[PDB]
Design a protein around this ligand. Structure first.
Ligand SMILES: *[C@@H]1O[C@H](CO)[C@@H](O[C@@H]2O[C@H](CO)[C@@H](O[C@@H]3O[C@H](CO)[C@@H](O)[C@H](O)[C@@H]3O)[C@H](O)[C@H]2NC(C)=O)[C@H](O)[C@H]1NC(C)=O
Ligand SMILES: *[C@@H]1O[C@H](CO)[C@@H](O[C@@H]2O[C@H](CO)[C@@H](O[C@@H]3O[C@H](CO)[C@@H](O)[C@H](O)[C@@H]3O)[C@H](O)[C@H]2NC(C)=O)[C@H](O)[C@H]1NC(C)=O
Ligand SMILES: *[C@@H]1O[C@H](CO)[C@@H](O[C@@H]2O[C@H](CO)[C@@H](O[C@@H]3O[C@H](CO)[C@@H](O)[C@H](O)[C@@H]3O)[C@H](O)[C@H]2NC(C)=O)[C@H](O)[C@H]1NC(C)=O
Ligand SMILES: *[C@@H]1O[C@H](CO)[C@@H](O[C@@H]2O[C@H](CO)[C@@H](O)[C@H](O)[C@H]2NC(C)=O)[C@H](O)[C@H]1NC(C)=O
Ligand SMILES: *[C@@H]1O[C@H](CO)[C@@H](O[C@@H]2O[C@H](CO)[C@@H](O)[C@H](O)[C@H]2NC(C)=O)[C@H](O)[C@H]1NC(C)=O
Ligand SMILES: *[C@@H]1O[C@H](CO)[C@@H](O[C@@H]2O[C@H](CO)[C@@H](O)[C@H](O)[C@H]2NC(C)=O)[C@H](O)[C@H]1NC(C)=O
Ligand SMILES: *[C@@H]1O[C@H](CO)[C@@H](O[C@@H]2O[C@H](CO)[C@@H](O)[C@H](O)[C@H]2NC(C)=O)[C@H](O)[C@H]1NC(C)=O
Ligand SMILES: *[C@@H]1O[C@H](CO)[C@@H](O[C@@H]2O[C@H](CO)[C@@H](O)[C@H](O)[C@H]2NC(C)=O)[C@H](O)[C@H]1NC(C)=O
Ligand SMILES: *[C@@H]1O[C@H](CO)[C@@H](O[C@@H]2O[C@H](CO)[C@@H](O)[C@H](O)[C@H]2NC(C)=O)[C@H](O)[C@H]1NC(C)=O
Ligand SMILES: *[C@@H]1O[C@H](CO)[C@@H](O[C@@H]2O[C@H](CO)[C@@H](O)[C@H](O)[C@H]2NC(C)=O)[C@H](O)[C@H]1NC(C)=O
Ligand SMILES: *[C@@H]1O[C@H](CO)[C@@H](O[C@@H]2O[C@H](CO)[C@@H](O)[C@H](O)[C@H]2NC(C)=O)[C@H](O)[C@H]1NC(C)=O
Ligand SMILES: *[C@@H]1O[C@H](CO)[C@@H](O[C@@H]2O[C@H](CO)[C@@H](O)[C@H](O)[C@H]2NC(C)=O)[C@H](O)[C@H]1NC(C)=O
Ligand SMILES: *[C@@H]1O[C@H](CO)[C@@H](O)[C@H](O)[C@H]1NC(C)=O
Ligand SMILES: *[C@@H]1O[C@H](CO)[C@@H](O)[C@H](O)[C@H]1NC(C)=O
Ligand SMILES: *[C@@H]1O[C@H](CO)[C@@H](O)[C@H](O)[C@H]1NC(C)=O
Lengths: 169, 321, 169, 321, 169, 321
């Protein structure tokens, strides 16, 4: 049994990017939330494909051909080329930095929305531990856990045993 | 009984930089900077380049005796020159508007050498005696193959008045020259006439050259000079030469049609029977990344040249188990 | 039948950008939250007007005239203008992509801020239904609903009144 | 009893592109790409272009008899030439530094043709006899209006020695020429003297021209050639012509005030009495957007040219079905 | 009372950027979150140093050496100079606008995370005042307050009193 | 008992702009636009500039008598010329390929004037009486110091045949000139011979000049003209002059080494014994912020020029006061 959202990643979870980790008396395990991870994979591969596909590539031939009394035009050609080099490197480096920053927050935002999406179901039937985990106030078997990952968690049915466990502290 | 929300972690040590964070390890990354080439030289959209071994464009068109390997090919996408060819003008002199010509010949669609003024047809001048030690072929004094160095025959040099109508229907690249001799005596040994000229006229061209007889340093042992000129004769137009000495007449012209434009890349890397859409003087690059750092002097549809070592985009999550 | 934000947009809400929708005994209807809407309209038109008004425009004439033995300089001019076209096309295409991603995230954040505002106000007197809606544990009339949109909601008034209904479940 | 949070939705299908999302439909949007022009040619900050329909700038300056429709406008912002004007140089030849002049005349603040050396004032030479079939005036043989083809009078061509001091307050644009004849017989029939010259000197100019008497191909029926030259004579400076033949003397110069650069525009679109701060060879642009895809060869303060079809900025929220 | 982030910044807090302000029996005071602000300072100075350090400058000498019969080549050089001017100003202005937006949201998100990290801990033992502040349902001495900033707060240990102070309305 | 979350505030009044928020007061901010020069002209990587006060590069090279010797400058990083130097070419004329030369002397590694043709060695010609009133050195008529205006001695001007082999192993900058006289009488009064020439020959150079004898406007009181030429004589090569009149012969050449390429700056700002990596015609710049708005004509490793008043980056939090 290990932590979540506020804490690190899971090498044990290999069937997606974001997912759930349960622990109960019948055993422990990871399961990926495939609808979240697909959306993210689609989004980031679209990000890469936008960075690549919107480049205008024309046929150009860079060639230095000026004589010894054309050094001024050579110098102008050199100014021009250099300027385009400086522009493109600055823009590319800063583009990857800025987009890399956005890609990582996106991943974090997706994680926190998944946490909210199960917190709003669980409500009082569980204790927020402050680390991406909920400790159920009742017993939650494997079908209860896939109910919660599916979004089909019957709150009411467990209030029965929950309020009793809460009062017991 | 617990349930926790979390993300994937793996055995990746790929690192990416953020605008706020440096050296961040991720699950998956994607490099958008091309850094791999062929190492060879290749075709360009199914068109081979024109490889000039040691021979220069000047030596190739004029027909320098020491480089007659490439006189076949009728199509090319660009020209490959050595950084400093050793065979260009064996006889010292100058090639007028040279850079403009090799830009023009940077990429030719159809190119066919033809004879326009046959050497036989110089009835009253000495054609086969215009050779020198500065242009050796076979160790024997030679001269440019595609132009004829005429000299007086039987102590006379009658005024030449030859013309040529462009009977073809592609443009013709015609070259000619003038020999700057060293003194009046030499001048009159080769030609009879002491003061000479060369008149060249087309529709656009209105040229007359006179020899500059001065004293100059020896180059390839010779202190004379030979200056060459060229023009594009359009279909149905005619070129009119006139001269009483120091003339370097054309024997062959070049049928020429060019649509696209290329550039002369200086490289010594060998041709590898491979195709590419983008080529550099150290190898070709067959990638569709937006950026490359291989070499600035690229020719074709290449990616943007940047001054970067890597341009990695994060695609995976932060790798922290 | 009523919908929520988590569910999609409301086509029958036509007097703002982000708003509210209730359902009491005396009837249902839409009301737009003005400050939030004006704040978004101002931000988005400021963004567009920044994209447009930050452009340096100089008087320049593009036409070219080089002769039949100045083909190299013509080719240099060509390279130069082609290079600026690639630069401008790439930068404009990717600028609009980046700022569109950010405008949509702006709307989402604004919508969730409005939801948090009323989440703090109702506290325990309503149940978060997990779809952008709160089901009241007491009765709130069409006037009583102005108050929640007014930010002037009096918790006290129903503290116990609400406590009773929650306990009878 | 429920209360809900929500956003607007409407009857809009305008879609935008995100960096991670394709084809997203939104409530309101804004396109920042201009793609509309008024189809006509207009003024530029309240200054009209100089529209030379079918006449080249050379013909306009020299006064090709087949042109003649325009030396009346005192100011213009750009020049409109057809892609290949029909009336350039009726008599074949070359215009020295032509493109540099055309650039100079790209945008002129004050322009006024004046007579500097009256045709009347040729005492000892034939003024009214320099005509040709190549430059015809409505069927009859003529010549450029603004330069005079002087000819020997009474079997003589005494050495001309004319001068001119620019007493105006503005710069003066003067043009002249030289006639390359075809043989000594023609040369002496036209100008009595066999070997001739033209010396032209100002403070800046130190020119001497000799005719190239050779044989060319015929162009507009003529195998002679006429080469033209130009200069800007600064106020109070004087030009000195000297010649014993083949002179194409000026009658008219041009007062010229240049306070701005512009660019020649090759277009067939017709003027439409409209003002703009931006103009393209297919129409004007009345916009404030940062980008356009209309045409690259703009004149004025224009949006930056892109190779894009849409540039839509999302302004509203996501639209529901 | 004394108000938190929702109603502006704290002039009184001078030994960090984000932090807490408590008031209890023994007195009131500010305490900075020396760790979170250190990384925030690191992040924003890394941003500035990336905008400065990613510009490679080439040694170039912009000069103008063309005579009065080369005005076309001057005009071409000038076209180039102006194009690079327009490109660099437009990108520098839009870069600074974009990342200023980004930076201000980075500060907003960080202090909302600081608020969330104690809302999750306190749970029912305190009342969210809707202004970045919590009114404890119990008494919370200086070590209880250092617990809350520590993240090591004993909910259970104050459940009792708080439950009363709450059953008190 | 309460615990509140909050952030810093101070007395800062620095404001920044957002893409959707204008004039936002922040706690901390950082301007990345350089705007401050030191008002002075300084070194460029520890090498001082060549400041030609009121002297053009031509006058300095030729030795205009009103331009100080000061050869005590062996290397420089750039050249400072005044906008329009007063002392350019005392005797009117033209400097061939002048701009290309100025570009070559923009940044010179080693520069040392040498004697190549001593004035003494002009035995059969009058060396010391080629002066003019347009080049006064001290109220008395003088002439360019580094080139000598040769004149006939004893009613003769024997035709000259001088040579010079570069025995150095650095390149040599050699200059010479030609005098265009105004009529045959003047022509023969200075060089007995009436039709003259100047032939100059190198391994590359093949020049022949003929004087243009015409009448021209008076300039600096003189109506003759003097055209100057230049060449780079490579080590071990030799220059060959030949002439029978109107020659303006070299006395001094200049040893030169060039392992870079700088520009000429037109500035009035005085030197300030400062060192800089970036210099503008109104002052140098220190810190390498990425951008500056000081002056477009910079030299060296400069920040990118922009048209901006401020580029402020927020670094802190929004300020509440
Ligand atoms: C190079 O040779 C070509 C072909 O011989 C010359 O073009 C020819 O010019 C003659 C003019 O004497 C044309 O004859 C004319 O034909 C038209 C009918 O099309 C007729 O109306 C006229 O009375 C006259 O007979 C001939 O058609 C034309 N041939 C072609 C194929 O263009 C050309 O002139 C020569 N080059 C030079 C320097 O002139
Ligand atoms: C073109 O004509 C103008 C005059 O229309 C010539 O400029 C004139 O030059 C003369 C002689 O240098 C000047 O007269 C002199 O005035 C000075 C004092 O100013 C006096 O010391 C002399 O004794 C003599 O009188 C006259 O000022 C000047 N006029 C103007 C208006 O500039 C000009 O030289 C002519 N162009 C050429 C190429 O000569
Ligand atoms: C300028 O003067 C130099 C020095 O005299 C000339 O270069 C010299 O050229 C001579 C032959 O013309 C060289 O002598 C020979 O060199 C060859 C090697 O190539 C050697 O095998 C022979 O035994 C003999 O020594 C000499 O090396 C060379 N000297 C120097 C200093 O380089 C040069 O030709 C003159 N320039 C002109 C164009 O007149
Ligand atoms: C990191 O993970 C990859 C997974 O692709 C490892 O590759 C596997 O690891 C070993 C072989 O090195 C075997 O268990 C598998 O057969 C490999 N193949 C695959 C596709 O799993 C890789 O080896 C790991 N890193 C290192 C250094 O081994
Ligand atoms: C990760 O760290 C390395 C090393 O700090 C960075 O590579 C550069 O390495 C050189 C020489 O060791 C250092 O002087 C530089 O500080 C490093 N460059 C940079 C940009 O900081 C590497 O770039 C960092 N990032 C990645 C993606 O690995
Ligand atoms: C070289 O030229 C001479 C002089 O023209 C030739 O001798 C004469 O040739 C002309 C025709 O060219 C004849 O009409 C004469 O009869 C010849 N001799 C005389 C007395 O004039 C001579 O034949 C030429 N040599 C060669 C090798 O052909
Ligand atoms: C989409 O809705 C808009 C706005 O409701 C329609 O625009 C107008 O709607 C107003 C109602 O106040 C009326 O003036 C007209 O019905 C509409 N006028 C015009 C010219 O648009 C718009 O027509 C609708 N589009 C469609 C066809 O669905
Ligand atoms: C996004 O929408 C556009 C336009 O609606 C799509 O463009 C398609 O264009 C082709 C014609 O070449 C036709 O199939 C239709 O006009 C468009 N198809 C659609 C989707 O209606 C574009 O393909 C769409 N993007 C994607 C993901 O395909
Ligand atoms: C053509 O020129 C000739 C010679 O200059 C003119 O004949 C001379 O005219 C001058 C002046 O009228 C007289 O002084 C001579 O007596 C004439 N000499 C002879 C021998 O005729 C002749 O007048 C000119 N012809 C025309 C028609 O003007
Ligand atoms: C803004 O506040 C700063 C810091 O309090 C002031 O700068 C200091 O002023 C104090 C006076 O209390 C001095 O002790 C320091 O010498 C000043 N510098 C330092 C190190 O902070 C600044 O004067 C204030 N600005 C205004 C508006 O007066
Ligand atoms: C943003 O703040 C700046 C500086 O505080 C304002 O600049 C000047 O403000 C005064 C009073 O508002 C005006 O008289 C000037 O005309 C303003 N100059 C500029 C550049 O606008 C500015 O007003 C504020 N924002 C705007 C655009 O008004
Ligand atoms: C100018 O040269 C003349 C003639 O060369 C000098 O007069 C002398 O004449 C003799 C014989 O004709 C020449 O050999 C010498 O050149 C001169 N020497 C003598 C005294 O015979 C004349 O002296 C030279 N210059 C002047 C003006 O004296
Ligand atoms: C090489 O280029 C060809 C185009 O002929 C393309 O189909 C292929 O993807 C490339 N192969 C690689 C990536 O080596
Ligand atoms: C055209 O320009 C005028 C200002 O001269 C502007 O007010 C008007 O709206 C513009 N028309 C178009 C085509 O938008
Ligand atoms: C100026 O630059 C020098 C290095 O060239 C540096 O040491 C110094 O900090 C700078 N001076 C200032 C404070 O502007």
């Amino acid at each position: 049994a290990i932590a979540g959202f506020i804490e690190g990643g899971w090498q044990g979870m290999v069937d997606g990017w974001y997912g759930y980790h349960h622990s109960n008396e019948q055993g422990s395990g990871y399961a990926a939330d495939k609808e979240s991870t697909q959306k993210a994979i689609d989004g980031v591969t679209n990000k890469v494909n936008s960075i690549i596909d919107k480049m205008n590539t024309q046929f150009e031939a860079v060639g230095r051909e000026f004589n010894n009394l054309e050094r001024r035009i050579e110098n102008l050609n050199k100014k021009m080329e250099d300027g385009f080099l400086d522009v493109w490197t600055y823009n590319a480096e800063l583009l990857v930095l800025m987009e890399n920053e956005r890609t990582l927050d996106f991943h974090d935002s997706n994680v926190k929305n998944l946490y909210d999406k199960v917190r709003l179901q669980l409500r009082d039937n569980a204790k927020e531990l402050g680390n991406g985990c909920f400790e159920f106030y009742h017993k939650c078997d494997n079908e209860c856990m896939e109910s919660v990952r599916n979004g089909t968690y019957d709150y009411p049915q467990y209030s029965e045993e929950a309020r009793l466990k809460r009062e017991e502290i | 009984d617990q349930i926790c929300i979390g993300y994937h972690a793996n055995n990746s040590t790929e690192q990416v930089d953020t605008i706020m964070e440096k050296n961040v390890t991720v699950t998956h990354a994607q490099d958008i900077l091309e850094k791999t080439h062929n190492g060879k030289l290749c075709d360009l959209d199914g068109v081979k380049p024109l490889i000039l071994r040691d021979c220069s464009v000047a030596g190739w068109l004029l027909g320098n005796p020491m480089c007659d390997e490439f006189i076949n090919v009728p199509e090319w996408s660009y020209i490959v020159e050595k950084a400093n060819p050793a065979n260009d003008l064996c006889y010292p002199g100058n090639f007028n508007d040279y850079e403009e010509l090799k830009h023009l010949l940077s990429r030719i669609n159809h190119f066919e050498k033809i004879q326009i003024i046959p050497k036989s047809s110089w009835s009253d001048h000495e054609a086969s005696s215009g050779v020198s030690s500065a242009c050796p072929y076979q160790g024997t004094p030679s001269f440019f193959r595609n132009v004829i160095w005429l000299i007086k025959k039987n102590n006379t040099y009658p005024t030449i008045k030859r013309s040529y109508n462009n009977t073809n229907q592609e443009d013709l690249l015609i070259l000619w020259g003038i020999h700057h001799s060293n003194d009046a005596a030499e001048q009159t040994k080769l030609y009879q006439n002491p003061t000479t000229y060369i008149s060249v006229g087309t529709s656009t061209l209105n040229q007359r050259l006179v020899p500059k007889i001065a004293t100059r340093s020896k180059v390839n042992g010779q202190s004379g000079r030979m200056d060459f000129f060229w023009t594009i004769l359009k279909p149905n137009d005619a070129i009119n030469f006139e001269s009483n000495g120091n003339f370097i007449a054309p024997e062959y012209a070049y049928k020429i049609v060019k649509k696209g434009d290329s550039a002369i890349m200086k490289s010594e890397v060998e041709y590898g029977n491979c195709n590419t859409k983008c080529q550099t003087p150290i190898g070709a690059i067959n990638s569709s990344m937006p950026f490359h750092n291989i070499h600035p002097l690229t020719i074709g549809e290449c990616p943007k040249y940047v001054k970067s070592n890597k341009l990695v985009l994060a695609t995976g999550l932060r790798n922290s188990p």
